[PDB]
Amino acid sequence: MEFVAKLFKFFKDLLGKFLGNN
Amino acid sequence: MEFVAKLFKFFKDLLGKFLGNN
Amino acid sequence: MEFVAKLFKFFKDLLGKFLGNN
Amino acid sequence: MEFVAKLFKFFKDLLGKFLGNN
Amino acid sequence: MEFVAKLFKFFKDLLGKFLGNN
Amino acid sequence: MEFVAKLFKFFKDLLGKFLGNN
Amino acid sequence: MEFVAKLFKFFKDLLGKFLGNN
Amino acid sequence: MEFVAKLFKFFKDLLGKFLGNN
Amino acid sequence: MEFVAKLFKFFKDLLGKFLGNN
Amino acid sequence: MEFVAKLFKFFKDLLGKFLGNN
Amino acid sequence: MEFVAKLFKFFKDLLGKFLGNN
Amino acid sequence: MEFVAKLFKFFKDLLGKFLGNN
Amino acid sequence: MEFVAKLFKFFKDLLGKFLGNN
Amino acid sequence: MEFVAKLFKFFKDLLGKFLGNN
Amino acid sequence: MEFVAKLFKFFKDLLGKFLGNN
Amino acid sequence: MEFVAKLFKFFKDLLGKFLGNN
Amino acid sequence: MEFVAKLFKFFKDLLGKFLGNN
Amino acid sequence: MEFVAKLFKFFKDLLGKFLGNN
Amino acid sequence: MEFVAKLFKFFKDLLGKFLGNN
Amino acid sequence: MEFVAKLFKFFKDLLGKFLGNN
Looking at residue E3, what DSSP letter applies?
H
**Which residues, 6 or more positions from H13, have their beta carbon under 8 angstroms from its beta carbon?**
G8, G12, H22
What's CA S12's distance to the chain center, in Å? 3
For residue O21, report the phi and psi dihedrals to the nearest 5 degrees: -130, 25
| Closest listed residue to residue Q4, CA positions, set N4, N15, A19 | N4
Q: List C-alpha distances in Å: E22 to D19, D21, E18, P18.
A: 13, 10, 9, 64
For residues M3 and K17, give the distance between their C-alpha atoms in angstroms, rounded to a whole number.
Answer: 27
CA–CA gap between residue R1 and residue T15 (Å, rounded): 28
Q: How many CB pairs under 8 A join E and I?
A: 11
- Chain H interface test: which of D1, D3, D8 (most H C-beta within 10 Å): D3
Which residue in chain N is spatially nearest to Q4 when comparing CA positions?
A: N3
Torsion over CA: K12, H11, K20, O21 (sign): negative
Q: Are J18 and Q15 in contact (CB under 8 A)?
A: yes
Give CA–CA dist D17/E12, Å, rounded. Answer: 17
φ, ψ of residue E15 to 5 degrees: the values are -60, -35
**Cβ-contact L13, L21 below 8 angstroms:** no
Instruction: Please judge whether S6 and T11 are an interchain contact, meaning their C-beta atoms are less than 8 angstroms apart.
Output: no
CB contact (8 A) between residue L9 and residue M8:
yes
Radius of gyration over every alpha carbon of chain E, rounded to an integer in angstroms: 9
Q: Nearest CA to CA, how far is P17 from chain R (Å)?
A: 7
The answer to whether residues I9 and H7 touch, using CB atoms and an 8 Å cutoff, is no
Neighbours of K (≥3 Cβ pairs closer than 8 A)? L, O
- Whether R3 and M18 have beta carbons less than 8 Å apart is answered as yes
Helix then strand then coil, in percent of chain L rounded to 5, is 75, 0, 25
Instruction: Give CA–CA dist J20/J16, Å, rounded.
Output: 6
Q: Residue M15 in contact with residue G20, Cβ under 8 Å?
A: no
Cα gap L15→O13, rounded to integer Å: 28
Are C2 and H18 in contact by the 8 Å Cβ rule? The answer is no
Chain D residue with the nearest C-alpha to that of H18: D3
Distance CA F9, CA F14 (A): 9
Radius of gyration of chain H (CA): 9
For residue D14, give the nearest of R20, C19, B6, E8 by alpha carbon.
Answer: C19
CB T4 within 8 A of CB S3: yes
* CA gyration radius, chain Q: 9
| B3: Cβ contacts below 8 Å, ≥ 6 apart | A18, A19, A20, A21, F4
Q: How far apart are CA A22 and CA D16, in angstroms?
A: 36
Residues ≥6 apart with Cβ < 8 Å to B9: B1, F8
DSSP state of N22: -
Give Cα separations from K20 to K12, P3, R8, T6 (angstroms). 12, 10, 21, 42
User: DSSP string spanning M1-22?
Assistant: --HHHHHHHHHHHHHHHHHT--
The candidate with the shortest Cα–Cα distance to P15, out of R4, A7, H9, H3, is: H3
